[model samples]
Target: AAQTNAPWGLARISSTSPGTSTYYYDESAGQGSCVYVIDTGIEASHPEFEGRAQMVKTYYYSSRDGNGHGTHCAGTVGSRTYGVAKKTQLFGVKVLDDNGSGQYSTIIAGMDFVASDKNNRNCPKGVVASLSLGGGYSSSVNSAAARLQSSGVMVAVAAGNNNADARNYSPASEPSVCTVGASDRYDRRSSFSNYGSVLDIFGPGTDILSTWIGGSTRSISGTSMATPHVAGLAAYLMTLGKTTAASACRYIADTANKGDLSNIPFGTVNLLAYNNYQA
Candidate 1:
C-alpha cells in the first residue's frame, strides 16, 4: 500500500476492530465525518469497497496494466474488507495507470480536484490523500501539495521503502507534508522503511494483508501499506473538525501509539494526540 506490492500488506488490519474508526473531537462537538482516498482506480464492485468508491475522478496519465501497484496500494487504504477506513469514500486518480508508473503532474491534477470539490460549502469531510507512490522530489508536486494544504485538504504519503535517511520528494518530502513511516505490530520501524526528520508518524506495515487484482486477497508488503493506516486514523480524527493539514499532522503525531518510540529514529511518538477534538 505504501512502498512495494509484496505479500505483507495484509498484516496491517486491526486485530481488534472493523475499519473506519470514529472518535470524537473535544472541541467540535460533531459526530460524523468523511475522508477521501487518492490512489489507483478501485474494483468498482468489490463488496468491501462498495458504497465507498466516490470516483471523484480518474485518469490514465502513465503506464498501463503492467502496473497493479496502484490497485494494491488503494485496497490497503480503503478496500471494503481489508481497508482501515471502510466508511471512507475513495476519489481515485489514475495517474499511474496499469503500469505502476506516472508523472508527478498527473498526480498533481488529482490533488487539484480534491481541493476544489466543494469550494462554496463545508461538507464535514476531509481528504486523506493516502499515496503510496513517489519518485524523487519535484518542486511542481510540492507546489500542488501546498495548494491542497491551503485549501483544507490533508496529504499523507509513504516514507518510501528505500530506507533512505532523508525525505523522498515530489510530495512526501514537501514542507508541511505529514510523512509516515512503516511500523509493525511491535511498533518497531519496518526494516525497509525510510527514516529521518521527514517522518512525522508511523503505522502498521511490516506484514499488512490486503486485496489485489483477480479478486484474490493476500498479504502485500511495503511503506505503501503503512501510509493508509495513518490515513484511516486521520479520517477518524477529522470527525473533530481538525481538517487542516497542520492540525491533522499535529493531532496524529501527538497521539501516535509511541510503542516503539525508542526504536524509531525520532524517539518517542504520541499517536493518539493530534485530534483537535478528542473527547
Candidate 2:
C-alpha cells in the first residue's frame, strides 16, 4: 500500500526501503504527538497535510510560507507522505522573513511562544520545536532554547550548511538542543554539512523530497532538512509515553544507527535510524 506522499524518509525511519515500507500510513504513525516548525510560516492549505497543520506564531512573515523552507520542514515532521510522524499535529512558527533572513530576537520570541501558555492546546504529548534556521553565535538565543528544553519542550536545530564548525552558530551551538547534520544517500556526511561535536546526529538531507509551499513537492538539501527528522522522532517518542525531553534525547542517541564516515575527520558518526517501532 503505497502512500500518496513521497515516503523515503519515513520508510528509512521505519526500518524499510521506500518502495517496501509496510509502515506506510500506519494508524500509530504519530497520533498524539505535536511538532512546532519554528522557521518560515507554512502554506496552511497544503493538501499533503489534509488540513491538519496549523500556524501558531508569526513574527515577520505571514501565516503562509512565502519562502519554501518552513513548509518543507513541516512536511518532513508530519506530512502524509514525507513525514516521520505522519499523524502528529504540525504547527508553524514564522520566525524568518520572506527573504529567508531573521533576527535573533525574533527566533527567541518563537521559542518563547512555545514555552508560554497561549498554545496549551498543542501540549500533553509534549512538543518538539524544529528549527531549520541558524546564525552567528548568540548567547541569548542559546539561553532561550535551553529554557524551552528545561521547561520540557524538546528543541532540535540544524547544524548549518557552511561546512565549518557548528560551534560558531546559534541554536546549533546551544548545548541543550539536539543539533543535526546532513547525510547523503550512502550515510556519509554531505560535503556542505557542518561537522564536529556540536552536531548530535546526522539525517538524510541530501536531495530530500518533501512537501513544498503552494501544494507541490520538491527536493532540497541542507542540515535544515536533517533537523526535522530528529524533531519528528523526538515528538513521536513523546507520544509513545517516553517521559521527558532528556529521555527522548537519550533514546535517540542510544538507538541511533552507527555510521562509518571514513573519509571525514570527525571520526565515526551516529545516524538516526528508527527500528523496532511497530506501533
Candidate 3:
C-alpha cells in the first residue's frame, strides 16, 4: 500500500515491482552509482534528497532550481519518498537558464561535465544521465551522449512534449539512448507525448508529484517528468552490477511491463512502453 504522503509515481512503480519500495541508498545506495539531472538545475538543499543531491557543475547559470523543472525530475529519480532509486545519489548540472532556455553549446558542455571523472566518479558501476530538455537537432549533443555511453553512462532523454515527431528533436532522436515518452496511470499515452520508432520506452508523466524548489513539494507534468523514471531505473539496475549502459538499456526495455496503447499508431503498435517493474 502507498503511504498517504508517497508520490503517485513512486506508488505506481512500486506497485509494478512488488518489493522495490524497500530499496534505498543514502551514501551509495550500496552500488555507488549516481543519477545526473541536466535541466534548469536543482535546489540542492531540497530535503527530499536527504542531503544526497549534488550540484556539481553549472554552464549558463548557478546550480539552483529557479525554474523547478530539474528538482522535480531529480525527485522522481532519487528522492527518498518520490523516486524509484530512492537511495541513490542525485547530481544536478545546470544547463538551462532561469527562463528554461539553453544554448546547444551549454547543454553539450553540461553533458561533458557529467562524463568527467570528478562528477561521474568513473566508478565501476554505471551512471545515469537524466535529460528532460530538447531542441532542434544538434550533432554536438548526440555526439556527447555517444561518448558518455561508450564510457558506461546510461542516457535517458525525454521524447519531447510537443506531440509531434520526436525525430525532429535533438538528443531525443539520438541513437543508442533511451528515449522516454509519457503515459498516464492507465497506460495510455499522454496527449502531449511525442511518438515514433525513435522513442524507446514510456513512464508515468501526467500529474506526477515530486520534490520542488525552496524545500517544498508539488505536482507537475511532461515527458520531462517521464524521462527521470527510466534514469532512476537505470541507476537501480547498475546497483545490481549490470556493468554497461547497453546491457542495462536492453534489460529495462526487455523487462518492462507492456500494456496496450491503442491510441498509438500501428507501426508503433509493438512499441509499448512500461511504467512498472515486475519485481
lDDT of each: 0.60, 0.77, 0.75
Q: What's each prediction's TM-score? A: 0.77, 0.90, 0.88
**Total backbone clashes of model 3?**
2
Q: Which candidate number has the best TM-score?
A: 2
lDDT, candidate 2, 82-194, per-residue tens: 88787888888888998888899888888888878325764667778899998998899999989888877888889899988889998889887788888766556788888
Q: Summarize candidate 3's per-residue lDDT along 8-97 as a digit string, tens digits.
A: 555555454322323223334425678889888888788888888888878753677788889899988988777877777778888998
How far in Å is the alpha carbon of 20 misplaced in model 3? Answer: 14
Runs off by more than 4 Å, candidate 1: 1-32, 61-67, 118-122, 240-246, 259-263, 266-279
Each model's Cα RMSD: 6.2, 2.5, 3.4
Q: Give candidate 1's error at residue 19 in angstroms.
A: 18
Candidate 1 lDDT, 25-142, residue by residue in tens: 2322222434445666555454656665545566754322234455555566656556554456655556666656667778888878778873532445565667777778788887
Clashing pairs in 3: 25-29, 25-87
Ranking by lDDT: 2, 3, 1
Best by lDDT: 2
lDDT of 3: 0.75
